[PDB]
Amino acid sequence: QALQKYSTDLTARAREGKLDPVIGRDNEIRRVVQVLSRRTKNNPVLIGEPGVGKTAIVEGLAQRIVAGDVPESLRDKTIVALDLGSMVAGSKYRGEFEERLKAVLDDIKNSAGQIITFIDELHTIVGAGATAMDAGNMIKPMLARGELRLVGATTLDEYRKHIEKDAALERRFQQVYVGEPSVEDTIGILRGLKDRYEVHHGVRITDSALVAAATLSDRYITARFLPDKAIDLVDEAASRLRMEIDSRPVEIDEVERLVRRLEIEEMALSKEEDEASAERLAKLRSELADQKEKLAELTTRWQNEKNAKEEVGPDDIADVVSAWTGIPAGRLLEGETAKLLRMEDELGKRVIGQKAAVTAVSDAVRRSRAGVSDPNRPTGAFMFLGPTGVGKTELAKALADFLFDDERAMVRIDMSEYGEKHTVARLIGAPPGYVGYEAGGQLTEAVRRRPYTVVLFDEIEKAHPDVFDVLLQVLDEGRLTDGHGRTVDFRNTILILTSNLGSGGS
């Protein structure tokens, strides 16, 4: 009855149908079972990266126990989920934690091998209650005899930081490795989890939406792991669509709030006894009217659509992927294809001449939004060089303006300070153990956030002929690794190198 005080119950929740389905992963569950049913030292430990699904395997084992797909050794075993945080709740005296742990262990032992423990995130068990090294290793005798079974799950680097330090206790566990599935497996997972979300948000989810999520979040979001960064997209898309079913849709809800703000500002600018603000006021009114125009247009078009968007599609997923990690991944929704056909005449407003270069850049920008370019390579890697005062830096500053509407949004590095070899450690960072190490790289950290900039290497020929070598990977694919060992991807940038070799020969 101490278990009832310091533990939840997982098989009960699996019986009441409160656990999500578990699809696939038969090998891992079979190995967990056959390690859980041996003579001595029957303690498995799921281990892997954060997100691949480890608690899911244990909940699948619980559902499988409830159903009856387990061998004869594991019938009616009543998994229990311990909680060490509630066991150290109030134990300020000398033995209050020890006696609780002894009570729980004796209760687990009094059953004839029925209870199966489950300590999630078992790296929190090492220094459980300390003051000397006494507690957290009272289970050490029962672990070796195989009296408590103790399924547990930790990440892959919180395991070597806390447990592999204590090789006397690391011996009692058997490691089960859980690697992340592929896209064809994430699709099968999504196809089975697409009912709880359909019910929670009163919407319907197309199958092409699932396929598009599993495909897009594997090439665009590279910081997380697969079975989870694909469910996040579907969840956010469904929640957005349900928010829109509340009568107003999007792109009317923003224009309304914008016109309201414009009106509040114009009503306060009217009582200004000046002359400098009499010219600013005559512009805000024009803006207000030109916005009221399109507001009324949208309001009328909504009526046509409503009299004469109920499911999530393969483009709401792209809308989410574009809202987060602002790379544009949509499908050229007719408001920007005209701009993308006008690109050359729009860049010809700031750079005059050099049609051969304007067209060569515009083609590369255009055939990336049409899905023709190679998905694993930078969207463009150009080096244009000529005489001085011609426009080869003006073009790079005009492309950034055309794309992001702020010339200060590109990552410019001036390659005339990289005169000596050792300056390379500026854009890649210092190795472990040296002075500037927590700061990491500069190019690396600048592209790791906002991975959609334009990168400009001004005057590439004035650097040492060893900085060109760190670019062989950045140019052939998008990878460059800093001192911490994390790789950033340059597959969404445009790399530009300006130079002046052979000043004006031919």
Partner 1 sequence: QALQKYSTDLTARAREGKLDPVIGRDNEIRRVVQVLSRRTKNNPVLIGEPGVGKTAIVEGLAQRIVAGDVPESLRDKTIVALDLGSMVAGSKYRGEFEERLKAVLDDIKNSAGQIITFIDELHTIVGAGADAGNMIKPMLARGELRLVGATTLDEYRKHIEKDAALERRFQQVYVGEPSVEDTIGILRGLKDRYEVHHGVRITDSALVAAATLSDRYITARFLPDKAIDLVDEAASRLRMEIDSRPVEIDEVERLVRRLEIEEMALSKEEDEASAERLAKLRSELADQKEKLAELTTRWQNEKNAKEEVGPDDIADVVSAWTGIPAGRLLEGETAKLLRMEDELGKRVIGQKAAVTAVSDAVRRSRAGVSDPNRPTGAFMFLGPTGVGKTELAKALADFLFDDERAMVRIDMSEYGEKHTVARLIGAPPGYVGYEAGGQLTEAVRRRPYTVVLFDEIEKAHPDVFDVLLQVLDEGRLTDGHGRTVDFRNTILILTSNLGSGGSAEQVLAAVRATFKPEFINRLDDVLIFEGLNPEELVRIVDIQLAQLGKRLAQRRLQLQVSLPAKRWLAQRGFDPVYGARPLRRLVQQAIGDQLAKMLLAGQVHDGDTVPVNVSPDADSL
Ligand X SMILES: Nc1ncnc2c1ncn2[C@@H]1O[C@H](COP(=O)(O)OP(=O)(O)OP(O)(O)=S)[C@@H](O)[C@H]1O
Any idea how long the chain is? 506
Instruction: Determine contact, residues 417/423, Cβ cutoff 8 Å.
Output: yes
> Chain centroid to CA 163: how far?
28
335 binds partner 1, rule: CB under 8 A = no
By CB under 8 A, the residues from 138 to 157 that bind partner 1 are: 138, 140-141, 156
Give the shortest CB-80-to-partner 1 separation in angstroms. Answer: 21
The tokens describing 374, both together, are: 């190679």
Helix residue spans in 7-115 (DSSP H): 10-15, 26-36, 55-67, 96-110
Residue with Cβ nearer ligand X (311 or 407): 407
335 binds, among partner 1, ligand X, none (CB under 5 to 8 A by kind): none
Closest C-alpha among 104, 169, 167, 93 to residue 131: 93
One-character DSSP codes across 99-115: HHHHHHHHHHHHSSS--
Residue with Cβ nearer partner 1 (354 or 362): 362
123 binds, among ligand X, partner 1, none (CB under 5 to 8 A by kind): none
Per-residue contact track with partner 1, 96 to 135, x per CB under 8 A? x-xx--x----------------------------xxxx-
Residue with Cβ nearer ligand X (23 or 269): 23
Residue list, annotated binding site for ATP: 48-55, 386-393
Q: Identify the residue among 485, 503, 504, 506 touching partner 1 (CB under 8 A).
A: 485
The residue behind tokens 């687990």 is 108
Give the shortest CB-37-to-partner 1 separation in angstroms. Answer: 6
373 binds partner 1, rule: CB under 8 A = yes
Give the shortest CB-421-to-ligand X separation in angstroms. Answer: 22
Residue 252: which residues within 8 A CB-CB, separation 6 or more?
A: 295, 298, 299, 302
226 binds partner 1, rule: CB under 8 A = no
309 binds partner 1, rule: CB under 8 A = no
By CB under 8 A, the residues from 11 to 30 that bind partner 1 are: 23-24, 26-27, 30
Residue with Cβ nearer ligand X (178 or 255): 178
348 binds, among partner 1, ligand X, none (CB under 5 to 8 A by kind): none
342 binds partner 1, rule: CB under 8 A = no
Per-residue contact track with partner 1, 430 to 469, x per CB under 8 A? -xxxx--xx---------------------------x--x
Give the shortest CB-321-to-partner 1 separation in angstroms. Answer: 15
- Give the residues across from 457 on adjacent strands: 413, 497
Residue 130: which residues within 8 A CB-CB, separation 6 or more?
A: 136
| Tally of CB atoms within 10 A around 462 | 14
Q: Identify the residue among 78, 155, 208, 500 touching partner 1 (CB under 8 A).
A: 208
137 binds, among ligand X, partner 1, none (CB under 5 to 8 A by kind): partner 1
The residue behind tokens 């790289």 is 441
56 binds, among ligand X, partner 1, none (CB under 5 to 8 A by kind): ligand X
The residue behind tokens 């370019």 is 373
CB nearest ligand X: which residue? 53
Provide the strand spans (E) within 114-150: 118-120
> Footprint of ligand X on this chain (CB under 6 A)?
20-25, 40, 50-56, 144, 155, 168, 171, 189, 193, 227-228, 231, 351-353, 388-394, 500
3-state secondary structure of 236: helix
Helix residue spans in 326-411 (DSSP H): 337-347, 355-369, 392-404
Give the shortest CB-118-to-ligand X separation in angstroms. Answer: 12
Residue with Cβ nearer partner 1 (259 or 413): 413
Instruction: Determine contact, residues 78/40, Cβ cutoff 8 Å.
Output: no
Q: Burial, 436: exposed, middle or buried (Cβ in 10 Å; 0-12, 13-18, 19+)?
A: exposed
HSE value, Cβ hemisphere, 13 Å, CA-based, for 35: 21
39 binds, among ligand X, partner 1, none (CB under 5 to 8 A by kind): partner 1
20 binds, among ligand X, partner 1, none (CB under 5 to 8 A by kind): ligand X
| Tally of CB atoms within 10 A around 168 | 8
